[PDB]
């Protein structure tokens, strides 16, 4: 028996809440729209990772359309003004998009793990990425269809809302037969969707970082073993340490060639090391040094270009991995308050005042942070790629 006005929050706090939600909504809309325009318009952009980025943009658009304004209108107004169909659609879409985002991040990390740690393996094709996207969507559908199929709007008789029309308040919550099944479903969803993909992504990105750094270190070492041993041969006085220097050069040349026209240049370089090794074996150093001094010509004409181009791809590959790590970490950090608040309100038996504080001040903030994550990914993509910056300028110049 409690009468409640149609608007509950103070006008100032309601205004700041709605303006923040509108700001994040506009950011998400603009970012996802420009990302979709960039990926669709430019044909060179289309790759497996970029296809998964487009899928992420589609999921974020689904959140922006079917979840954010509905949640904002639910928060500003008392109870749930919309019908049961709208509430179930909103919740189901939110869950589907969360699962799709997690699985797309996992697929992106797996693809880059294959690209970096095991580059010899063939690169995944566009068709394989598309069927992976389809099976990811199917998995999300089949893992969070129970939320939609089992839901209802319940009427609360003790609170009645009035403007001059009085009606009991309505709210849509998961009406499980008992709290045990709801808790076990929420915990298994947290384990399958958040915790296990978190651990997998973190450990696999760490392994990529280890693998990526090791490749460049060996390349520099082999290059400097060939370079510094060449100076040894020039300054060597007898044939014992010319043989030793040539022995070190040969192993480095074989190692550098193993690292993945380029192999042909190492075929010539190794043959000349053998040519200088035969002269050193014969005994005299002077003609072996002359044969070693001609290795500089092929090193400059076949190996310097190889080393600088091999170095180039390595550096460029880190930036993409770092961006994918940042977007994965920001996704995990943004959804952490929601999952930890659910766990605290479900497992950690707190004081009724603590739960009251949780509902009023912590739940809306965690909900806003999770929804605001959808507007963060386009910012990361634009600021970590010069290609997306060019797309931003082209779209703005075209439409303005």
């Amino acid at each position, epitope marked *: 028996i409690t009468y409640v006005n149609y608007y509950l929050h103070q006008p100032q706090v309601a205004a700041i809440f709605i303006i923040s939600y509108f700001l994040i909504f506009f950011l998400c809309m603009m970012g996802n729209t420009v990302v979709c325009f960039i990926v669709m318009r430019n044909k060179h952009m289309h790759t497996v990772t970029n296809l998964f980025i487009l899928n992420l943009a589609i999921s974020d658009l689904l959140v922006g359309i079917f979840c954010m304004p509905i949640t904002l209108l639910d928060n500003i107004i008392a109870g749930w003004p919309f019908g049961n169909t709208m509430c179930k659609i909103s919740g189901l879409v939110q869950g589907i998009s969360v699962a799709a985002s997690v699985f797309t991040l996992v697929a992106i990390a797996v693809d880059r793990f294959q690209c970096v740690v095991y580059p010899f393996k063939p690169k995944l094709t566009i068709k394989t990425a598309f069927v992976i996207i389809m099976i990811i969507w199917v998995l999300a559908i089949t893992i969070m269809s129970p939320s939609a199929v089992m839901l209802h709007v319940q009427e609360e008789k003790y609170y009645r809302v009035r403007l001059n029309k009085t009606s009991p308040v309505y709210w849509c919550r998961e009406d499980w037969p008992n709290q045990e099944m709801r808790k076990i479903y929420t915990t298994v969803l947290f384990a399958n969707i958040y915790l296990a993909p978190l651990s997998l992504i973190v450990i696999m990105y760490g392994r990529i970082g280890i693998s990526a750094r090791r490749q460049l270190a060996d390349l520099e070492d082999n290059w400097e073993t060939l370079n510094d041993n060449l100076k040894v041969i020039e300054k060597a006085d007898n044939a014992a340490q010319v043989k030793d220097a040539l022995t070190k050069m040969r*192993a480095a040349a*074989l190692d550098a060639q193993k690292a993945t026209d380029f192999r042909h240049g190492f075929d010539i370089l190794v043959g000349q090391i053998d040519d200088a090794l035969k002269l050193a074996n014969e005994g005299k150093v002077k003609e072996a040094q002359a044969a070693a001094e001609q290795l500089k010509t092929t090193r400059n004409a076949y190996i310097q270009k190889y080393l600088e181009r091999a170095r180039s791809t390595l550096r460029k590959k880190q930036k993409i991995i770092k961006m994918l790590l940042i977007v994965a970490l920001l996704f995990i950090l943004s959804w952490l308050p929601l999952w930890t608040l659910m766990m605290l309100s479900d497992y950690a038996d707190l004081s009724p005042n603590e739960l009251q504080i949780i509902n009023i001040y912590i739940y809306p903030f965690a909900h806003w942070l999770a929804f605001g994550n959808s507007s963060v990914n386009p910012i990361i993509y634009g600021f970590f790629n010069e290609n997306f910056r060019r797309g931003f300028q082209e779209a703005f110049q075209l439409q303005l």
Partner: antibody
Amino acid sequence: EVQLVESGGGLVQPGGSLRLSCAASGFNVVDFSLHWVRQAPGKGLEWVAYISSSSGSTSYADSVKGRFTISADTSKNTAYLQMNSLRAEDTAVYYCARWGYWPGEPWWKAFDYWGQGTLVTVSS
Amino acid sequence: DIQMTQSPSSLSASVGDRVTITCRASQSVSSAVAWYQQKPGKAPKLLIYSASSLYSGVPSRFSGSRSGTDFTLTISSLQPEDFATYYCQQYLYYSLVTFGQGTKVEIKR
């Protein structure tokens, strides 16, 4: 089918002379380097010498330098290892093996084909 | 000069076992080591070349790998005809060949 066959191994007095012959069938000795690797009774393999008749490049182990000479006659498609001033520790089973030329697989396949090995015994 | 140390000289193992032989090189040669099998009274047979590549015709149970200057041979299932002496050779240059000391795989009892 390629095949290395060793012959000439026999008992000799210390400080004597011997000539091992390695006949190569199937392949030509021009396209491969021929190596001599010896294994003492009860001990492990040790590399003795090699010849590359394409470039005529010969080399010997430090224990046999100045005492063994390796030649290769491509008309008969054979190699020879002349062992003179033989010492008592030169008694062993000698194998003639085939190592291809750089680049590519022939070089990376080291000693893919060996001979049956001929035993030399150096004692008075 | 490139010392090639094959430490696990004694290997007592039974049929079906997964035996492992390690080999340590003094210098940092590339993946240019080979593994040979020699049964008593016969010539060595090439098992592994390039430190990882299986030679043609030999059983697939043998497998070699390289980490740093540590080259390891492995037999996943020790068949009864796998009892022989295994040698670890490095082939960096024609005149620089150093075999390992050899490991005699015997029958566990």
